[PDB]
Design a binder for this molecule. Sequence first.
Ligand SMILES: [Fe+3]
Ligand SMILES: [Fe+3]
Length: 252
Amino acid sequence: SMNLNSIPAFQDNYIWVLTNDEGRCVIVDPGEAAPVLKAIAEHKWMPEAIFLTHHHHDHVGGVKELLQHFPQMTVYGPAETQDKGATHLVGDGDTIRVLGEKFTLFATPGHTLGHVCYFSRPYLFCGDTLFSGGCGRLFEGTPSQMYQSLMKINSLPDDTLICCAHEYTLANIKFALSILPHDSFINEYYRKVKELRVKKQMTLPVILKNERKINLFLRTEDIDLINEINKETILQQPEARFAWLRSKKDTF
Ligand SMILES: [Fe+3]
Ligand SMILES: [Fe+3]
């Protein structure tokens, strides 16, 4: 049984921390060490590991210093984080025992080529692959890769807690409303998210069952979304419509 905490970092990052009953924690994508060190001290956590989802600085920046403080830790990460301090390279389909729990790794290329997600039901650490109401910008991968990646995530159980790295939800939903302005779910979510954000409260994590109702990038096969896209371009291939939506989001 694990409990979830978050530590804000930089401007809109969250460093997720999962802790077991023994107070042992895994720290996910620590872009900044200081807030994590402070949190560890506050919670009297005993760090066991860091999970890295991808190589971006806002996810890995704090690794070296955290390792300096807690040399007992293993830093799990994909090959693309090997030079960012990963001490245990993880690949697609790997299972690892952390905090006494089993985490499944799956590759979710798109945002970066080597991006991975960590899943230990219900927790999904999906870094910058999926955001609430959105998905990672495709810095390295193709729309096809991200689409595949999103389908992998979407295949997870309804109760999956989406613990993505960024407070992008409000902007994501504003984008969503530019596509389906009258969508009941998205509008409801916009309302909820606006109130959280105005109160300076985080919008994460979110439950996948709900997330897929409001995330256009998880609604590629939704009739309503298809009908909307059809108003401007006819794209039979889901990857193409996902790509279209992603392109729209790129410039929104
Ligand atoms: Fe990133
Ligand atoms: Fe990021």
